[PDB]
Amino acid sequence: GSFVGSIDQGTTSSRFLIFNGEGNPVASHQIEFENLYPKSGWHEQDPYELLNSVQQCIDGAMHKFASLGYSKENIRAIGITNQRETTVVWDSVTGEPLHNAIVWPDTRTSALVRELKARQSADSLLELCGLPLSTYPSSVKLLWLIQNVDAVKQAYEEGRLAFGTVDSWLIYKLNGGAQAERPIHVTDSTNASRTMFMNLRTLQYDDKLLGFFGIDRNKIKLPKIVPSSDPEAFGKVATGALAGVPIAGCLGDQSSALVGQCGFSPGQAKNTYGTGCFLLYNVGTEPVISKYGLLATVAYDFGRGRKPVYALEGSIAVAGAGITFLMNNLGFAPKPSEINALAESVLDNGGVVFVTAFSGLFAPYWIDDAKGTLFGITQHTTKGHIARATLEATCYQTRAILDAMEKDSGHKLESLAVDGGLSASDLCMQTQADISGIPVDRPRMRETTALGAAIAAGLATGVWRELDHVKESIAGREVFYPKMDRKKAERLFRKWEQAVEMSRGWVRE
Template sequence: MSNDAVDTPNHHEDHSSLPQGIHETEEEKKRHWFVGSVDQGTTSTRFLIFNGEGDPVASHQVELGSLYPKSGWHEQEPLDLLSSVEQCINGAVQKFEALGHSKADIRSIGITNQRETTVVWDSNTGEPLYNAIAWPDTRTKNLVRELRSRELADTLTELCGLPLSTYPSSVKLLWLLQNVDVVKQAYEEGRLAFGTVDSWLIYRLNGGAQAEKPIHVTDSTNASRTMFMNLRTLKYDDKLLGFFGIDKHKIQLPKIVPSSDPKCFGKLTTGALAGVSIAGCLGDQSSALVGQCGFNAGRAKNTYGTGCFLLYNVGSEPVISKYGLLATVAYDFGALRKPVYALEGSIAVAGSGVNFLMNNLGFMEQSSQITDLALEVEDNGGVVFVTAFSGLFAPYWIDDAKGTLFGITHHTTKGHIARATLEATCYQTKAILDAMEKDSNHKLESLAVDGGMSNSDLCMQTQADISGILVDRPAMRETTALGAAIAAGLATGVWSDFEDLREIGQTGRKVFTPQMEPAVAAKLFKNWERAVEMSRGWMKDHPE
């Protein structure tokens, strides 16, 4: 299969010939049509089955482990990612049928995934050649510094929308080529296949190397996280590949296709849904924007998951940030529609900071208890926690910071540190919102939220207070999985256009209104910025 994506103007095929049943009434659609969604995240995998109204009917979840072989290293077993997906599909279908539904009514499935996590495998055998290097991994920090010193390094962002950092897939692949002999040998012999988690799963769910025609694809939202794709052409860019020293004739890159398509992603070959089409694919943060129905320019969402990711829809032309944000593909739904772009602010540590208090320090038994612990005190008691476990991402991009607690006294309790942990995510979100306002010349009036930490009323009220804007939380918070289901459903006739989705997720929303005096919020944020500056330099070998 060619590594080159087809030209952008032509790769949105006309899918007006939809599957049989498209002429059913709206009532029949809602009653009979279902779409599945694989939500493969950093700490767990889930499979959810949605009805035509966008409500989850059945689901199954499997927790995932991670490997930390060295400080700053974060790996996952690729075969574990695959088996977790297969388990979740079978488990959810069993529950779905137990409710009296038929799996024959599941029209298609979508996939959403952790994005920059990098997988390499042998195209001859279909077996992984190394553990997946997860998106927060910082082993490449020295490599990134070397890359930043290269000629043309400052021109990359204009092409791909991303700055050089430990975050994107490109530097992870380059590290593998430089440090893992079996990967380097496969590259030299032309049998090295590269992909993000979506590509790996789609490849294996379609039968892998044993398939008659192995399917090795990615969608443009995931491809835009590699630093290999030109944002405007949605094709691999020779200048970008050349900068990283990647010879596209020696490596099998996934073909870039739209996020919503009835054929490009193939079909499941095994398990409870064997034969069902994979018709949608979106990186998890793009998927959450779609699940929040952020289809209009100016709409924004923030997902509080393992990390925290704020996407702002900027329309059909990319906006290259001047203030530390990323430019990315928001979604690309084909069928003659133009791709839509977003500005993104990425925070490495959000829910993982809560897990740190729970697992490493034993503050509580369940992550959901963080709010109760934080409410034991009236405020943070002067404690500020810069949760730079993987350095700091947007808008700071400080890779030599370490997690740092400031302001600890004899008065400090677990409750103060719990509050400071929640506030760290809210402060970084405020910094991203300020950068987005500068890039777009527009102040957001409200922010749609989802993800595990959004369940905390205290955290969301704090976010509203610190940011000075409305925080809008849906009642149904499975928005990331819903986005992939929407991509698949649009490709297979469950929904015909965005108009059909207007009412999805709009009932039962809760809005948090700022209650803090702006001057007080500004003082707290200034204190946070001071702490960020003081956390710099902890990773330096020879402090100045």
């Protein structure tokens, strides 16, 4: 086959895309599924809601694939990319879930996180797995379920509990789950580096990480850790429109976006804009443990005599959310297109600085007692100035994270690719280039995340032979270049840093 498919299983969305050898999607289908919020801070999904949405997107895309004269014979393989950390538990014997998936934003584990941080050896986990303790990793979600949901506890104690991130669950069921010969219970190194069970350097489950959380290896069934690109580890789709088509790629969704942007060299970074931001920074074959609260994770692992590549990761809470705040909360304008117009309406920020720390500031500032704080207001401040400061806020924090990634890794920032929500704003992307002093590359093929999984599967099956082949095949309103004098750029950043400094201490108990 000449085409490659890509399952993109998201937090709010599932979709299937079929790419050609030049990385362009020829057929696609997207479905918004149900998310469940039982309590405040609780976030759950029916595991079958994830699967069935994927399956319908597969069917939907292949009907339009048929309308252009192709069949599953034309697809050489498919890759999977998925929301990370989201924790799924099922019965190893039946393959049926024992509880709804706990989605990555779920906060029901705070108390447990507090307890675990006080435990002995909690100091050592960052160095082992790349991540600190928080509500996010799958380790604490799974531990919570074992201690609070009893169908899970007894499954565990009886040796029939299976754990999986959403990739593992989808691969397991798409291969036929329990009912099938050679059942596939696997996860790729990227997804696996998000749990806190995997030694980041060896890419193997570590007994000291598993021991810290109290999960017994020979009682629970963990997914075998395999490369993100492999022609046989992931099995094949058992039934349906893709019956018999191999799965050959598997990547956590943020890693997939880095791959889709061809960020294959150290110093190459990406930012995905949504309600917030996820930033990843290729740091090469050698892992880096951050000194500024960045996450150390696997960028991609392509097996074939390939040394796995690592990344540093940072996040921003308020990006697109800031635009939503200007539209709905303040009534500046009803659509984001017009917020950008307001920002372009004025020459500069009018001295305005908006520290958008709605829920505090994360890496590298780590300021939890700040709230949204707007500086520089006068009688002559207008909506346009505030709109600019809102866009500038994300670029300032983006630079702050990229700068921290530079000092941690010692690899000079070489490029920044962007995709999703705010990346469409020409003004803010230009501002990012100006502030950071680096070109901002924005592809007009907008399905970068899905493209990453296609590349992984395509490499496993020879659609592309090397990453150099990938970049030039994919290569064949796209790049913003620094145009601001660097003195003005440093001035603007220093008053950002200052606004931040004055924002700390606002929330007193």
